[PDB]
């Protein structure tokens, strides 16, 4: 499902080494190491990101994300 | 917030 | 205040835009040549608007003359449109703070985001065509529109009219490219990806250009200016740096090798760790 | 050969560990993690990228790409 | 606990490969390698960060940090 | 020896995971992965780079490069 | 000891995969790979760096450095 599409409101490095972003008022975490700098770059530049996951409640995990210029 | 027209 | 944007000729159109800019904004000291500048919107209280009467869709004729746009002054957003024949203001859902006396206000369910408008219009701005003929069609669609929820054709009309009014006020590049469609040849303006990217970077540009002091170039995300004539040929009016001025952090610029960078852009490609460690650490 | 030249319209990391970029209206993907920061940096700075392949094809993989300011 | 919220006043790469930041007048170190470039870019742009740790005295360690848009 | 000094005219990721740059009209490639984002940053910002190698023919390899600002 | 404090005058990736910086007229090298992007970032954005080490003779190694805007 497309869970959220919006700008990153905050990001957080977690104690278990996963990485959280808040998008559309909901928090999503990922364990994909490759995504940590990419998500911070999106936050820094105000990219619209699309979080895709099988559950969309706040606190769900994701491994797929789109980085848009608009 | 995404760009408004 | 009320202004007219007259589409009769390229002269009338550019003169209209220049008059609006002179009234609502003040030139930057360091990006100004003659009376052509990058200007900063003068502060006004939140909710202040100006009206734009659309004229000249049929060259120099007093017809197709019942459309007015309501523009929030501090950010140049179109808040909605007025049918002056029916005295009705159709107002986007993100502008409930804009009140226009003397009209019937229809508060719409539709918000003014380009994402929403492009979805309802089934029309992407990248590659969108605008001609005098399609502006007449847009006008007729807006005059036929009724109700609280934008239709496809009303949304296409708003996409076209916002591009050639508010976005042209912001960006001399869009003014220059579109105005060719007003000539007797009646060619077609095609909005390019670069045009679209300019509109999407307006707030970021607005935060950076007040710091310009004659550096050899300016870099803001995907946008590059290599000299003052590139700046002036592209940008006309910027925000007074408004929430759109800041994404994160508090540093507008970094000067790197006599180029003024948006600090956020540099930060976003300098936040990489050692490449071998990145790629092996799966 | 040169498959596509232009700025990056969007990028996406997929659940199957591929990284897609859209360039000049066509989507291409790579599984080289080295290219993820390079491509995303190219995206956010507006570099012109040239995707190169032995066999150019929409929806096909790549691992050769030129970067120009 | 949320120990310190503010801009990074300086950062420091340490001989044991940990990484120190000073936030709200107190120094905090982390052994999370991935935080090194993320913190430096936050520092560069004046990003507000929140250091989270079990102890908040200057000299404490952390493995959790939030990157804010303030 | 100093093979080439100037700004990076283009860079290129290669199918064998090497990385090519063109400097002062000559092309050089490196197998050192750490140089890939560093050279990209240099290219983006107009650094003057000096390619250093014992073979300076165009199309040759390198693993030493100096980075200078204006 | 504070070996050197100032702006990075140049940086250099070396054939042995170490990384050299020149600060306040003196050259120092480090073998720590994650310092390579951290130092190049500092060089590009004009940070003041403070090289800290047991020995501070020109051409010596280091693995501690402070970064200030």
Burial of C27 (0-12, 13-18, 19+ CB in 10 A): middle
Q: How many residues are recorded in chain G? A: 69
Distance from the Cα of residue A55 to its chain's centroid? 14
Confirm whether C167 is a catalytic residue.
yes
Largest CA distance in chain A: 32
Number of helical H runs and strand E runs in chain C? 11, 15
Contact between chains at D34 and F15 (C-beta distance less than 8 A): no
- List of chains touching A (3+ CB pairs within 8 A): B, C, D, E
Q: Which residues contact E41 (CB under 8 A, 6 or more apart)?
A: A40, A44, C267, C268, C270, C271, E47, G41
Task: Determine contact: C256 vs chain F, CB below 8 A.
Answer: yes
E14 closest CA partner among C152, G34, C254: G34
D5 within 8 A of D49, measured Cβ to Cβ:
yes
3 state SS of F6: strand
C74 closest CA partner among C248, C262, C241: C241
Cα F68 to Cα G9: distance, rounded to the nearest angstrom: 7
C279 within 8 A of D34, measured Cβ to Cβ:
yes
Phi then psi for C65, rounded to 5 degrees?
A: -120, 30
CA angle C274, C279, D3 (to 5 degrees): 110
Cα E23 to Cα F48: distance, rounded to the nearest angstrom: 35
Residues of G in Cβ contact (< 8 Å) with C270: 37, 40-41, 44-45
D68 within 8 A of F10, measured Cβ to Cβ:
yes
Cα C174 to Cα C171: distance, rounded to the nearest angstrom: 5
Q: Which residues contact G55 (CB under 8 A, 6 or more apart)?
A: none
Cα dihedral sign for C185, C190, C194, C198?
Answer: positive
Distance from the Cα of residue F28 to its chain's centroid? 6
3 state SS of F28: strand
Ranges of each domain in chain D: 1-69
Cα C192 to Cα C122: distance, rounded to the nearest angstrom: 17
Q: Which of C23, C29, C167, C211 is catalytic?
A: C167
In chain A, after which residues is the C-to-N distance over 2.5 Å, breaking the chain? none
For A22-61, b/e burial (b = at least 16 CB within 10 A) is bbeebbbebebbbbbbbbbbbbbbbbbbbbbbeebeeebe
Which tokens sit at C196? Answer: 């679209």
Cα dihedral C85→C86→C87→C92 (10° resolution): -110
CA neighbours closer than 13 Å in the CB half-sphere of residue A30: 23
Resolution (A): 1.6
Cα F5 to Cα G12: distance, rounded to the nearest angstrom: 13
Please name the helix (run of DSSP H) or strand (run of DSSP E) that holds residue A40, with its range, or none.
helix A35-45
Contact between chains at E36 and G38 (C-beta distance less than 8 A): yes
CA angle D40, D45, D49 (to 5 degrees): 65
Which candidate from C77, C243, C244 shows the least CB-CB separation from B5?
Answer: C77
F41 closest CA partner among G66, C35, D47: D47
Which letter does DSSP use for residue C163 in this model?
I
Cα C57 to Cα C132: distance, rounded to the nearest angstrom: 7
A34 within 8 A of A12, measured Cβ to Cβ:
no
Burial of A4 (0-12, 13-18, 19+ CB in 10 A): buried
- Residue B2: how many CB atoms within 10 A of its CB? 16
State how far the alpha carbon of F2 is from the alpha carbons of C73, F55, F61, in Å. Answer: 58, 10, 13
Cα F54 to Cα F39: distance, rounded to the nearest angstrom: 20
Which tokens sit at C91? Answer: 């107002």
Cα C68 to Cα D37: distance, rounded to the nearest angstrom: 47
Cα D31 to Cα A34: distance, rounded to the nearest angstrom: 12
Residues of C in Cβ contact (< 8 Å) with E65: none
State how far the alpha carbon of C194 is from the alpha carbons of C37, C171, D7, D46, F34, in Å. Answer: 21, 12, 10, 10, 33
Rg (CA), chain B: 4
Ranges of each domain in chain C: 1-170, 171-282
Please name the helix (run of DSSP H) or strand (run of DSSP E) that holds residue C2, with its range, or none.
strand C2-6
Q: How many residues are recorded in chain B? A: 5
Please name the helix (run of DSSP H) or strand (run of DSSP E) that holds residue D52, with its range, or none.
strand D48-52
Phi then psi for C77, rounded to 5 degrees?
A: -75, 135
Q: Please give, rounded to a whole number of angstroms, the shortest distance from the CA of A34 to a CA of chain D.
A: 7
Chain D, residues 44-63, CB within 8 A of chain C, namely 44-46
- Residue C202: how many CB atoms within 10 A of its CB? 21
Cα C10 to Cα C176: distance, rounded to the nearest angstrom: 9
Which letter does DSSP use for residue D10 in this model?
E
For E13-24, b/e burial (b = at least 16 CB within 10 A) is bbeeebbbbbbb
Phi then psi for C173, rounded to 5 degrees?
A: -60, -40
Cα C156 to Cα C160: distance, rounded to the nearest angstrom: 6
Contact between chains at B3 and C199 (C-beta distance less than 8 A): yes
Beta bridge partners of D8: D23
Q: Which residues contact C259 (CB under 8 A, 6 or more apart)?
A: C215, C216, C217, C218, C219, F45, F46
F49 within 8 A of F23, measured Cβ to Cβ:
yes
C264 within 8 A of C249, measured Cβ to Cβ:
yes
Task: Determine contact: F61 vs chain D, CB below 8 A.
Answer: no
Distance from the Cα of residue C210 to its chain's centroid? 19
Phi then psi for C20, rounded to 5 degrees?
A: -60, -50
Which tokens sit at C187? Answer: 């060619």
Residues of F in Cβ contact (< 8 Å) with G40: 38, 41-42, 67
Which letter does DSSP use for residue C6 in this model?
E
Beta bridge partners of F54: none
- Residue F25: how many CB atoms within 10 A of its CB? 9
Cα C256 to Cα F46: distance, rounded to the nearest angstrom: 9
Q: Which residues contact C269 (CB under 8 A, 6 or more apart)?
A: A41, D37, D41, D44, D45, F37, F40, F41, F44
């Amino acid at each position: 499902a497309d869970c959220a599409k919006g700008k990153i409101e905050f990001s957080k490095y977690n104690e278990d080494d996963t990485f959280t972003v808040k998008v559309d008022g909901k928090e999503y975490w990922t364990s994909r190491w490759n995504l940590q700098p990419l998500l911070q770059s999106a936050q820094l530049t105000g990219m619209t990101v699309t979080i895709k996951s099988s559950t969309c409640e706040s606190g769900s995990g994701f491994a797929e994300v789109q980085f848009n210029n608009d | 917030r995404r760009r408004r027209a | 205040r009320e202004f007219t944007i007259d589409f009769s000729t390229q002269q009338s159109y550019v003169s209209s835009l220049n008059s609006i800019r002179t009234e609502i904004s003040t030139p930057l000291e360091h990006i100004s040549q003659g009376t052509t500048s990058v200007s900063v919107i003068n502060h006004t209280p939140p909710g202040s608007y100006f009206a734009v009467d659309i004229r000249g869709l049929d060259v120099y004729q007093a017809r197709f003359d019942h459309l007015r746009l309501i523009i929030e002054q501090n950010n140049l957003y179109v808040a909605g449109f007025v049918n002056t024949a029916t005295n009705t203001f159709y107002r986007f859902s993100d502008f409930t703070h804009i009140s226009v006396p003397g009209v019937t206000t229809v508060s719409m369910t539709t918000d003014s985001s380009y994402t929403t408008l492009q979805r309802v219009a089934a029309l992407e701005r990248s590659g969108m065509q605008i001609s005098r003929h399609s502006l007449v069609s847009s006008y007729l669609a807006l005059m036929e529109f009724s109700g609280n929820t934008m239709t496809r054709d009303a949304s296409r009309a708003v996409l076209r009219f916002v591009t050639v009014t508010a976005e042209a006020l912001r960006f001399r590049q869009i003014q220059r490219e579109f105005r060719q469609a007003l000539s007797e040849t009646a060619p077609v303006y095609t909005m390019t990806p670069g045009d679209v990217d300019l509109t999407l970077n307006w707030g970021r540009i607005s935060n950076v250009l007040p710091e310009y002091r004659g550096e050899d170039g300016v870099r803001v995300g995907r946008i590059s200016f290599n000299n003052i004539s590139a700046i002036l040929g592209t940008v006309a009016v910027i925000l007074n740096c408004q929430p759109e001025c800041q994404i994160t952090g508090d540093r507008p610029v970094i000067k790197i090798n006599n180029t003024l960078w948006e600090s956020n852009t540099a930060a976003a490609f300098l936040n990489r760790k050692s490449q071998f460690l990145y790629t092996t650490g799966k």
